[PDB]
Design a protein around this ligand. Structure first.
Ligand SMILES: *C(=O)CSCCNC(=O)CCNC(=O)[C@H](O)C(C)(C)COP(=O)(O)OP(=O)(O)OC[C@H]1O[C@@H](n2cnc3c(N)ncnc32)[C@H](O)[C@@H]1OP(=O)(O)O
Lengths: 4, 152, 71, 648
């Protein structure tokens, strides 16, 4: 889950 | 039920990916993020399709970071609820890993919520190693874990 | 040739004001940067007045805009 | 001019996957584009009203405030302040109180005084947090969004105003000091309001004392912190009197700050409930009480041990900053009294006692030797400040900084070795400063390795070689360094007895865990990567990559690791029974070594709480219990952070  | 893994071919498959990711993933992704990942690296995106529908989606990226090692990245992974525990996601990650290693990748990284035990078990079985702990890294609030798979 | 003319006109439409005025108002102005076949428009240094906000890069989607205007 | 009709038709004739960027914008500036349609992306989406437009409207109360309304407002302001201290944004959490936007317009003395006190507390906390700079990207949001926080009135005047408000309520409390139920409720409400005002004053005074430049005022806050216990007891007992919320209480506008929200994705902080407000303040007060004792330590090693023990508690962001600031009130002066170079010299003299620092040696009055040792101490002053700053961070981000500090510590080790060699040549005292630096390096490496267990970064199959590095190599080197340090102290003549005992216990427990894991693998009870291809050599090399920077002790590669940890070296090779017996013996040795240690502190009690149950399991499993089972064992880390309980 690409996270900031 | 025969499960077929087909690589990404054209933008007509984008609505299939967006539906699977949104209904499964928690963080919010705009359509331009999917467009970036698909267009820049179309060779690393694979789908799991049965009949005339879509039940799986893996979206990945590969780019050199800090000019030290070519690092691969698994950006999105989703399997439909009715079709989980059939090994679809494991095979998707295996195909992505094989594509990355054919692309001369040195390491593969990804993040996931610590509460999501299924993905942690899958990655530990596949051989991933927990590398860093990130507190409140997501929007929901769940602490994120950075898993790595060192190839060289 | 019609497709080429339309593409040239759209390319010339860049670097302008291109006020958005989405379906909820918000009177976005910004500057036009890119578009797609879904008619969604991405902006830059865009302000948002309810009914200034200095958003970074708005991505007003196709099925949320009413009528755009360029000064 | 409107061009929507001419724009939609043109856009509908694209290539189905073609963009319109000209030459300098591809997909990356297009990343992080705020899609102004989704609820989770666009930050901005009865009637929104600020304080100025609410005073005239009448929906706000700025005069003749009822006691329950005051109690509710104060309690919810406390909840918002705690939520901000927990890491949430200032504007969306604490400034939802319309009263603290401008306390000048407030006319009620109690509400105005409390608002000024809250603003002063926020200002002091923000200043202390920013000065220490021990907060990461997301552990604190010190941005004030351009607001002004009680910069006009002096802090002493605010404290005096709070004292006057408390004095004007003590008379009311005593006036009703006594069967009428209404007067009883009024007296209870007045007592609650007085308790809240007094606790606000106490906390503000504690922070003010921590903001003073004199270390004397720090110790004076202990009495007020003690008073805070009774104040919080009263504040928690009288909690069902204030006006409850309607989430939205009468006085607060949750969405009054919409033009000041950041343009990025929103996080939507959730203010805590009133029930948990009292507990958090009690924990914070206890933490500040623990912090206030750091001004009594006189040597560097005790200071470092105190910092480690405090950080092991997982404290809040504010308390760590307070500890850092009270340790280093200036950029170069510790506690504001002693220069750090003198502290490092005292630590060296107390730990190893080199001849150069000894007054009875000819090297104390020498010009060249004094300059050389001063240069070494000056070079050493920086890495220790960096190490303490690293200890000031949170648990997750300590590991990376500890791994990175090893480069500077290895450079310092090389410089110390060169200095000691030159001094010994001049004198004619060998490896004294080298021994000190080696001890600090080994302590850093040990804590770095254990932080992996503390943060659950180690998999089931990774335990067996992580514990080996701790047991056979690192702690073995540490024991030699401590023995050399203790020996040199007596040779030039026990403060290090407790550290030696603790190190022995830790080494014994680590060896027992390593043997248990090796036996578990031999039996077949440990799950390994079943597929793909991830060589254990690469995993080992990347796990122990940060240790490559240091030179003493030399790093151990995978090829050398197998030879040292191979069980085939013993003839005949030991079966799992033997490894179980060895683990039981190690656990028994650790238990005996701890039980023989006088005055067991809190750290010993927890370690005893894991050695005892695991020893019984090891002996029981040594008899062949569940030998045929292939299920993996369950490790519980609740008892101790670094050493789990082997549960079958
Ligand atoms: C940022 O993208 C990445 S986070 C990945 C996305 N998480 C998410 O919630 C969306 C997708 N999630 C899933 O549905 C599921 O987690 C996936 C993505 C792993 C898909 O599941 P699969 O069914 O494809 O997983 P398998 O391919 O079956 O293999 C999983 C391994 O882990 C064990 N496992 C899986 N789910 C489990 C549950 N619910 N409980 C226990 N164990 C679970 C599987 O059994 C398998 O190990 P095996 O022993 O079965 O081989």
């Amino acid at each position: 889950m690409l996270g900031p | 039920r025969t499960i077929r893994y087909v690589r990404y071919e054209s933008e007509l498959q984008m609505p299939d990916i967006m539906r699977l990711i949104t209904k499964d993933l928690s963080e919010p992704y705009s359509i331009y993020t999917y467009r970036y990942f698909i267009h820049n690296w179309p060779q690393l995106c694979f789908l799991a399709m049965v009949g005339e529908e879509c039940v799986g989606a893996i979206v990945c990226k590969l780019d050199m970071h800090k000019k030290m090692f070519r690092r691969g990245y698994i950006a999105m992974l989703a399997v439909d609820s009715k079709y989980r525990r059939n090994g679809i996601g494991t095979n998707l990650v295996k195909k992505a890993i094989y594509a990355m290693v054919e692309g001369d990748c040195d390491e593969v990284v990804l993040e996931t919520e610590i509460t999501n035990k299924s993905a942690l078990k899958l990655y530990e079985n596949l051989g991933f190693v927990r590398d860093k702990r990130l507190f409140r890294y997501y929007l929901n609030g769940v602490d994120a874990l950075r898993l790595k798979l060192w190839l060289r | 040739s019609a497709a080429e003319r339309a593409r040239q006109q759209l390319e010339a439409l860049l670097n302008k004001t291109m006020r958005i005025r989405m379906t909820d108002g918000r009177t976005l102005v910004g500057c036009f940067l890119c578009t797609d076949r879904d008619c969604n428009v991405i902006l830059g240094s865009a302000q948002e007045f309810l009914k200034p906000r200095v958003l970074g890069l708005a991505m007003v989607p196709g099925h949320h805009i009413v009528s755009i205007e360029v000064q | 001019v409107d061009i929507t009709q001419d724009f939609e038709e043109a856009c509908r004739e694209l290539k189905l996957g073609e963009l319109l960027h000209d030459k300098l914008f591809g997909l990356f500036e297009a990343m992080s584009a705020i899609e102004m349609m989704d609820p989770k992306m666009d930050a901005g989406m009865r009637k929104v009203l600020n304080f100025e437009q609410a005073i005239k409207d009448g929906t706000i109360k700025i005069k003749d405030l009822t006691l329950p309304e005051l109690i509710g407002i104060m309690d919810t302001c406390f909840c918002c302040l705690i939520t901000w201290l927990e890491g949430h944004s200032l504007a969306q959490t604490v400034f939802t109180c319309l009263y603290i936007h401008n306390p000048d317009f407030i006319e009620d003395p109690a509400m105005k005084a409390f608002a000024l006190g809250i603003l002063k507390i926020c200002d002091i906390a923000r200043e202390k947090v920013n000065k220490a700079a021990v907060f990461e990207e997301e552990d604190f949001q010190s941005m004030t969004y351009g607001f002004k926080m009680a910069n006009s009135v002096t802090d002493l005047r605010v404290t005096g105003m709070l004292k006057d408000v408390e004095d004007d309520m003590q008379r009311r409390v005593k006036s009703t000091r006594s069967r009428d139920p209404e007067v009883e409720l009024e007296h209870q409400q007045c007592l609650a309001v007085f308790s809240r005002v007094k606790f606000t004053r106490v906390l503000l005074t504690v922070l003010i004392a921590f903001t003073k430049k004199e270390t004397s005022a720090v110790a004076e806050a202990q009495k007020l912190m003690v008073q805070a216990a009774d104040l919080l007891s009263a504040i928690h007992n009288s909690l069902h009197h204030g006006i409850q919320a309607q989430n939205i209480m009468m006085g607060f506008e949750p969405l009054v700050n919409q033009r000041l929200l950041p343009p990025t994705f929103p996080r939507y902080a959730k203010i805590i409930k009133r029930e948990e407000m009292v507990n958090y303040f009690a924990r914070l007060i206890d933490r500040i009480k623990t912090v206030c004792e750091v001004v009594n330590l006189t040597n560097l090693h005790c200071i470092l041990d105190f910092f480690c023990e405090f950080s092991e508690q997982s404290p809040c962001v504010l308390s760590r900053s307070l500890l850092q600031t009270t340790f280093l009130v200036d950029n170069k002066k510790v506690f504001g009294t002693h220069l750090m170079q003198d502290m490092v010299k005292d630590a060296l003299r107390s730990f190893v006692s080199p001849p150069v620092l000894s007054p009875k040696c000819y090297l104390y009055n020498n010009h060249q030797a004094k300059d050389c040792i001063d240069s070494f101490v000056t070079h050493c002053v920086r890495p220790f400040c960096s190490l303490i700053q690293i200890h000031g961070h949170n648990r997750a981000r300590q590991r990376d900084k500890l791994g990175h500090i090893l480069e500077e510590f290895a450079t310092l080790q090389d410089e110390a070795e060169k200095v000691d060699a030159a001094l010994h040549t001049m004198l004619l005292h060998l490896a004294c400063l080298g021994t000190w630096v080696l001890y600090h390096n080994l302590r850093i490496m040990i804590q770095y390795l254990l932080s992996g267990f503390e943060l659950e970064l180690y998999s089931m199959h990774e335990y067996y070689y992580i514990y080996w590095y701790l047991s056979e190599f690192l702690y073995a080197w540490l024991m030699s360094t401590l023995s050399r340090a203790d020996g040199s102290q007596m040779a030039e003549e026990r403060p290090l007895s407790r550290e030696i005992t603790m190190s022995q216990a830790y080494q014994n427990m680590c060896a027992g865990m390593f043997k248990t894991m090796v036996a578990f693998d031999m039996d077949g009870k440990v799950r390994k990567p079943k597929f793909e291809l991830d060589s254990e050599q690469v995993r080992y090399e990347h796990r122990f990559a940060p240790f490559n920077s240091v030179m003493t002790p030399p790093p151990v590669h995978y090829l050398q690791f197998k030879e040292m940890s191979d069980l085939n070296k013993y003839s005949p090779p030991p079966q799992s029974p033997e490894l179980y017996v060895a683990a039981s013996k190690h656990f028994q040795q650790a238990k005996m070594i701890l039980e023989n240690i006088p005055n067991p502190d809190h750290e010993v009690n927890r370690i005893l709480k894991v050695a005892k149950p695991n020893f019984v399991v090891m002996k029981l499993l040594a008899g062949g219990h569940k030998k045929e089972s292939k299920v993996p064992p369950e490790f519980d880390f609740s008892a101790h952070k670094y050493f789990p309980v082997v549960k079958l």
